[PDB]
Curated annotation (Swiss-Prot), chain B:
It comes from Severe acute respiratory syndrome coronavirus 2 (2019-nCoV). The lineage of its organism: Viruses, Riboviria, Orthornavirae, Pisuviricota, Pisoniviricetes. Binds to host ACE2. RBD also interacts with the N-linked glycan on 'Asn-90' of ACE2. Cleavage of S generates a polybasic C-terminal sequence on S1 that binds to host Neuropilin-1 (NRP1) and Neuropilin-2 (NRP2) receptors. Interacts with host integrin alpha-5/beta-1 (ITGA5:ITGB1) and with ACE2 in complex with integrin alpha-5/beta-1 (ITGA5:ITGB1). May interact via cytoplasmic c-terminus with M protein. May interact (via N-terminus) with host bilirubin and biliverdin, thereby preventing antibody binding to the SARS-CoV-2 spike NTD via an allosteric mechanism. Changing residue 35 to K: In strain: Omicron/BA.1. Attaches the virion to the cell membrane by interacting with host receptor, initiating the infection. The major receptor is host ACE2. When S2/S2' has been cleaved, binding to the receptor triggers direct fusion at the cell membrane. When S2/S2' has not been cleaved, binding to the receptor results in internalization of the virus by endocytosis using host TFRC and GRM2 and leading to fusion of the virion membrane with the host endosomal membrane. Alternatively, may use NRP1/NRP2 and integrin as entry receptors. Residues 7-29 are annotated as: Disordered. This is Spike protein S1. The gene is S.
Amino acid sequence: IAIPTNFTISVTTEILPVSMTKTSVDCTMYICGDSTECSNLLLQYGSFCT
Amino acid sequence: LSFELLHAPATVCGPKKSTNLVKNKCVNFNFNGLTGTGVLTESNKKFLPF
């Protein structure tokens, strides 16, 4: 058998992500900017932005 | 006065009007063919002359 006659105390680092960046997108402003008729066309696609 | 429309880049065109409404107004704007909509604000940018 082999038995230890001494010890070492080791500190080791573990790294874990917990969060992302909370991002939001204004669907209408992304797709159509400030064009009224582009927005009207976008209404034809329903609830995709929602 | 004879007028000819060749394929070469059109050179002679009549005068064009002009108006302004600058700050804190949502305006459709046409700056020398650059068309858009938005609010115009004075800027600190430093465009090169050209």
